[PDB]
């Protein structure tokens, strides 16, 4: 019925607000990115600091792992993405082509492609091996908040402050679907469900929503949190109970029962907006990170 997530570790060291935390697919590591221009690597279980990864010239808003937990891509205000080899710390490629801050990024499930969204209102698809831009999508009319690939990589989901979520054919770059509901709030986050049937989408009106994007229908609504200013990640938690996990601008982490949409827990301790959360791929471990007045990461376990 309900989770029992308790604070285990508080990770410190980013010198400015944290923007993103992500667990590696193999469950060994946690990567964080930050407005301090740095990427940091922590042990997923003991929170033990591993290394710092640097090279971006301005703050980073997102970081993402390749399927094999070997590479990272980061999206920065310096208008680049960078492909990092985690074990050697090398910047392998610097993807240039966006005309404004790069906000979000993800590998496809094969880690041969990267998708990015930017304040320049485009979605771009990059080749991992050459670091070149394969397509630019004129996706939105306002800044793009989130970009995600589906289970086979055949589709890409986009989110923007223009109020739309869009689905794209990865091979053609064609828009296959535009989702919006009865109000048009800025869409601040989007991602596919692990089975690839649904998109979970956040809007700046304090609302998360589960969509069946084929049927074009909102299935579930998750409310209770505070989310009007910032692009807060949300997650499907599947290692124990089937939850929805999201930060909040009231400094708490919210956990919903996915089916019944009830708040089943709130996690307390950050001293600022909880901007990013992440769910461990095989343990009941939640990572959370907060903004300028906190600068810490926290590992909770149930």
């Amino acid at each position: 019925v309900k989770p029992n997530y308790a604070l285990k570790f508080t990770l410190a060291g980013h010198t400015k607000a944290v923007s993103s935390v992500k667990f590696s697919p193999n469950g060994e590591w946690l990567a964080s990115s930050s407005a301090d221009k740095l990427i940091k690597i922590w042990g997923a279980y003991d929170g033990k600091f591993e290394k710092t990864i640097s090279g971006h010239k301005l703050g980073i808003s997102d970081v993402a792992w390749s399927s094999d937990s070997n590479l990272l891509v980061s999206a920065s205000d310096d208008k680049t993405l960078k492909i990092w080899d985690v074990s050697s710390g090398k910047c392998l490629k610097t993807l240039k082509g966006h005309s404004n801050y790069v906000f979000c990024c993800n590998f496809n499930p094969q880690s041969n492609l990267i998708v990015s969204g930017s304040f320049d209102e485009s979605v771009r698809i990059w080749d991992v091996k050459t670091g070149k831009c394969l397509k630019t999508l004129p996706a939105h009319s306002d800044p793009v908040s989130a970009v995600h690939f589906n289970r086979d990589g055949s589709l890409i989901v986009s989110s923007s402050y223009d109020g739309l979520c869009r689905i794209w054919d990865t091979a053609s770059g064609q828009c296959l679907k535009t989702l919006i509901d009865d109000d048009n709030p800025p869409v601040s986050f989007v991602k596919f469900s692990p089975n690839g049937k649904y998109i979970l989408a956040a809007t700046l009106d304090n609302t998360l929503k589960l969509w069946d994007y084929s049927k074009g229908k909102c299935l579930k609504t998750y409310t209770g949190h505070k989310n009007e200013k910032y692009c807060i990640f949300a997650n499907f938690s599947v290692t124990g109970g089937k939850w929805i996990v999201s930060g909040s601008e009231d400094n708490l982490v919210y956990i919903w029962n996915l089916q019944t949409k009830e708040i089943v827990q709130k996690l307390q301790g950050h001293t600022d907006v909880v901007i990013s959360t992440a769910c461990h791929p095989t343990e009941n471990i939640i990572a959370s990170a907060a903004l300028e007045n906190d600068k810490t990461i926290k590992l909770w376990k149930s």
């Binding site: 944290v18 407005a35 703050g59 808003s61 997102d62 200013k229 910032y230 692009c231 901007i275 903004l291």
Partner: peptide, 5 residues
């Protein structure tokens, strides 16, 4: 920019 309102 994610850390900014």
């Amino acid at each position: 920019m994610r850390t900014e309102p």
